[PDB]
Amino acid sequence: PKSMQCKVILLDGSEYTCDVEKRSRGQVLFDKVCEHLNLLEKDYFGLTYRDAENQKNWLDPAKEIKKQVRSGAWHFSFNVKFYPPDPAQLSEDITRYYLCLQLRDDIVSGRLPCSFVTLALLGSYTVQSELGDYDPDECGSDYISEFRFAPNHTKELEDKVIELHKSHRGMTPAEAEMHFLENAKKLSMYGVDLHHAKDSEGVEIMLGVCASGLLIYRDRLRINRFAWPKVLKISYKRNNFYIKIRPGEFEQFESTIGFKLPNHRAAKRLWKVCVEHHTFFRLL
Numbered sequence: 001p002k003s004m005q006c007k008v009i010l011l012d013g014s015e016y017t018c019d020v021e022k023r024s025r026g027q028v029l030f031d032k033v034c035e036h037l038n039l040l041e042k043d044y045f046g047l048t049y050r051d052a053e054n055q056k057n058w059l060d061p062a063k064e065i066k067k068q069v070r071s072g073a074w075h076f077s078f079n080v081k082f083y084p085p086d087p088a089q090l091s092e093d094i095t096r097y098y099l100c101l102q103l104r105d106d107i108v109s110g111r112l113p114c115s116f117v118t119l120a121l122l123g124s125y126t127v128q129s130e131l132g133d134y135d136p137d138e139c140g141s142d143y144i145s146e147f148r149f150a151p152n153h154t155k156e157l158e159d160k161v162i163e164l165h166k167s168h169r170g171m172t173p174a175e176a177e178m179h180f181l182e183n184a185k186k187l188s189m190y191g192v193d194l195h196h197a198k199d200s201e202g203v204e205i206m207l208g209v210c211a212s213g214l215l216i217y218r219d220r221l222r223i224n225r226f227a228w229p230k231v232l233k234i235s236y237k238r239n240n241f242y243i244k245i246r247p248g249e250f251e252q253f254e255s256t257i258g259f260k261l262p263n264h265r266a267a268k269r270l271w272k273v274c275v276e277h278h279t280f281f282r283l284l
């Protein structure tokens with residue numbers, strides 16, 4: 001049996017290295033990573049790889065790893081795929097812990113926009129979790145945390161994190177992580193996966209996929225929202241992605257909204273993440 005070396009970037013930024021048989025399907029590697037992480041509530045998560053065009057792709061657990069990575073290295077990241085709308089209802093604190101780590105990266109990367117005050121508040125809960133109670137021995141007037149909190153750090157952001165950290169005395173890591181999640185879940189882009197596209201007139205839009213449904217970000221004004229029940233069907237053909245929307249009651253026929261993606265693979269990628277979001281959050 002010939003085995004291939006796999007490298008996985010974990011949500012703490014560490015590397016996990018393991019072997020799988022070269023013909024292995026994605027589920028084999030995922031199960032090894034989740035066992036390494038002591039994770040039981042696994043199906044919120046997944047593995048990503050970067051394709052020949054440098055796009056993020058989800059590793060399909062039903063398909064051979066080699067038929068997905070194809071010409072690329074067997075290098076993956078462990079990520080949240082399906083962001084729970086109500087993290088309090090997760091059964092395990094370790095699940096919430098990994099979800100916090102993902103959201104911290106979503107924030108630092110700028111995928112999850114966040115006000116100044118909420119950046120500082122989330123940062124303060126992270127510090128309480130990682131370091132425990134505020135200690136003025138480590139923190140002077142000139143303190144800057146090792147923790148990345150934001151896409152752009154400023155001294156006043158660092159100061160606000162400390163001021164808020166002082167308020168959290170006695171809070172345990174699990175408590176701080178639950179407060180982090182109860183704040184982060186309210187952000188308008190929480191768990192929204194964004195895809196570049198053009199509308200039927202050729203205007204550049206972003207299509208957002210999340211638990212609640214589909215979002216069409218045309219500009220700061222005119223955000224179109226389709227809750228999953230309103231979405232009758234989704235399809236792709238060539239570089240085109242199509243959403244069928246149910247008619248109001250007493251309407252005869254569903255409406256079709258068409259989008260142009262950069263290429264055929266971007267259209268398939270969007271269709272699949274939409275189907276998967278429909279599939280796991282039809283149930284959950």
Ligand SMILES: COc1ccc(C)cc1NC(=O)Nn1cnnc1
Nearest residue numbers: 027030043045046047061276279280
């Ligand atoms: C109950 O599990 C599901 C249900 C629906 C869907 C869409 C997915 C899963 N899980 C899943 O794919 N787990 N996994 C394996 N490798 N990466 C992630």
